[PDB]
Amino acid sequence: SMSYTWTGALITPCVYATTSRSASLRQKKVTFDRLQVLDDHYRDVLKEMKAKASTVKAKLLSVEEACKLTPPHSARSKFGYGAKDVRNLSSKAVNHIRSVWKDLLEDTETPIDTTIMAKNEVFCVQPEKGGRKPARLIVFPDLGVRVCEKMALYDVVSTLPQAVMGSSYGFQYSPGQRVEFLVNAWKAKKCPMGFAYDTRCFDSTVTENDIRVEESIYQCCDLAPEARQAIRSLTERLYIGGPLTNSKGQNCGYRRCRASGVLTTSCGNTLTCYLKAAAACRAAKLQDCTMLVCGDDLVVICESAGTQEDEASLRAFTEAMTRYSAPPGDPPKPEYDLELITSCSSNVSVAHDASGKRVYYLTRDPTTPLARAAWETARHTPVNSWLGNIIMYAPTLWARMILMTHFFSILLAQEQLEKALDCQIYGACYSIEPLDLPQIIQRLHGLSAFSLHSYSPGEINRVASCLRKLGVPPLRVWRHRARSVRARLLSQGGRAATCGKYLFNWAVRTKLKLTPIPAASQLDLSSWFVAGYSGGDIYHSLSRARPRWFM
Ligand SMILES: O=C(O)/C=C/c1ccc(NC(=O)C2(NC(=O)c3ccc4c(C5CCCCC5)c5n(c4c3)CC(=O)Nc3ccccc3-5)CCCC2)cc1
Ligand SMILES: O=C(O)CNC(=O)c1ccc(OCc2ccc(Cl)cc2)c(NC(=O)c2ccccc2)c1
């Protein structure tokens, strides 16, 4: 069947930001008929995945628990209430949610309406290789249905992927745990070879059968009967397909592929990618495979069979993936150094700590993070990508010297250090105070993140070249700026002084010996690095348990 069908009504609006003007270019790429052919390897991997899914017990969330997961700025319902009414448990919001729930239990077939919109994302236009990227498309159901998805499946999508895929499930790892996983897998091989597999338009390649197979895995959970019915109904009425409405309420067409804005998008994509890849590893006869899967992002680390054999085994892997309806965007390439593998737009790099010991960390090309940060300092945005980049890339030369320095000078000037800001981590929205960054960083990356040095020449050159290309002042200017920012933070005491001392320890002549922050252990990071929720409409406010009067 066609991934999409269009009436011709426009997908209307809600260095460069992607807009609805380029929607038709995206529409052409994502629209095609899928041909899928399954074999014994696919069926064998599925049964192995289902036997692991069988150990899961999932709970039904109450209306109140599902309401508390709704982001404050989540799109309002077309039925007379918004995200604020949902979070306050208003009678109208609650009544509508309960009637949506009852309808899921009673109607097993009527397709559920979804809205289609062009995503507005900021990218950097490099006129050296190609042109501007067209806008990605987001498909999501009404707020009432989104609350019902949480009741039925929040616990499933938060627990099942790790039970099924084990150590291969990428969203269970903090950045440092991800690096540790890749380094350990790489070290385990006699002669390692690794590759990234990029599927072309993954969401469009997801067939009706893929979506039913994904439900067959969910149905292996111990579930309340109403959760079992809601999952069955949601599969047939929403997850397999349905009609598309634009922002103006006009009929845009229909979808028979993965919706990008549903609670099961990340979990479904991860299970589907893992299934197809593990089966393709068997068809290609790759030896001692270790996989790392995050949605449609796949990394494979295996035992090398020789340079020519590896190229042939990769073409065999690609042929199997293509039969399973996961054709490649860029053809995969074997790599023989772990640092050369780009996965989830990141690569492993190495630095030294204050005692000269090697420390592995995750980094990336800083062009898109700096360009998005420039857009965010220019205009008020709903999500602060600079904040998520500081958190996730805290050990990097660029996040430390440029992002920390720039945003802490802005927060000092606006006197907004204590103001909680929204940022996205693995698709979920987190409300975080910048004053909590040293404790967050210590927990996610270790105390060494504040003392890294001896960065590689390749990493230093990539950062310096990026600054020149974007017209950003050189690294020496950032050191001078950080010294002043640090001095002002220290004078304020409490958490603000800790930002100065820890975040900007790199900027001082004679480096201070840093001891662990005692209040760091109090931060409740239990919802962090458990699962992926991209497009799942998930929110959490950062909480602190068992505080001490003097901390
Ligand atoms: O050789 C030497 O000894 C010294 C050289 C030297 C060169 C340039 C400066 N620039 C500045 O002082 C100003 N801009 C900046 O001090 C500046 C700060 C951050 C900048 C950023 C981002 C960096 C990441 C956080 C968000 C801000 C961008 N651009 C920046 C410029 C350059 C710019 O204007 N825009 C973009 C566009 C895309 C990407 C990045 C940028 C402020 C007043 C005059 C212009 C200072 C010193
Ligand atoms: O499931 C889906 O369908 C869509 N996929 C995702 O949602 C998705 C998959 C893997 C990801 O990253 C993994 C990673 C990267 C760097 C580091 Cl240091 C560690 C791990 C991210 N990235 C972030 O969330 C992010 C936010 C802010 C800053 C940096 C990364 C998103």
From Swiss-Prot:
Cofactor names: Mg(2+)
PTM description: The N-terminus is phosphorylated by host PRK2/PKN2.
Species this chain originates from: Hepatitis C virus genotype 1b (isolate Con1) (HCV)
Co-factor remark: Binds 2 magnesium ion that constitute a dinuclear catalytic metal center.
Catalytic activity: RNA(n) + a ribonucleoside 5'-triphosphate = RNA(n+1) + diphosphate
Activity regulation (UniProt): Activity is up-regulated by PRK2/PKN2-mediated phosphorylation.
Name of this chain's protein: RNA-directed RNA polymerase
Residue intervals of the RdRp catalytic domain: 192-310
Compartments it resides in: Host cytoplasm; Host endoplasmic reticulum membrane
Residues holding Mg(2+) 2: 198, 296-297
Protein topology in the membrane: Single-pass type IV membrane protein
Signal peptide: none
Function, as annotated: RNA-dependent RNA polymerase that performs primer-template recognition and RNA synthesis during viral replication. Initiates RNA transcription/replication at a flavin adenine dinucleotide (FAD), resulting in a 5'- FAD cap on viral RNAs. In this way, recognition of viral 5' RNA by host pattern recognition receptors can be bypassed, thereby evading activation of antiviral pathways.
Full-sequence portion shown in this chain: 2420 to 2992 of 3010
Residues recorded with modification Phosphoserine: 20
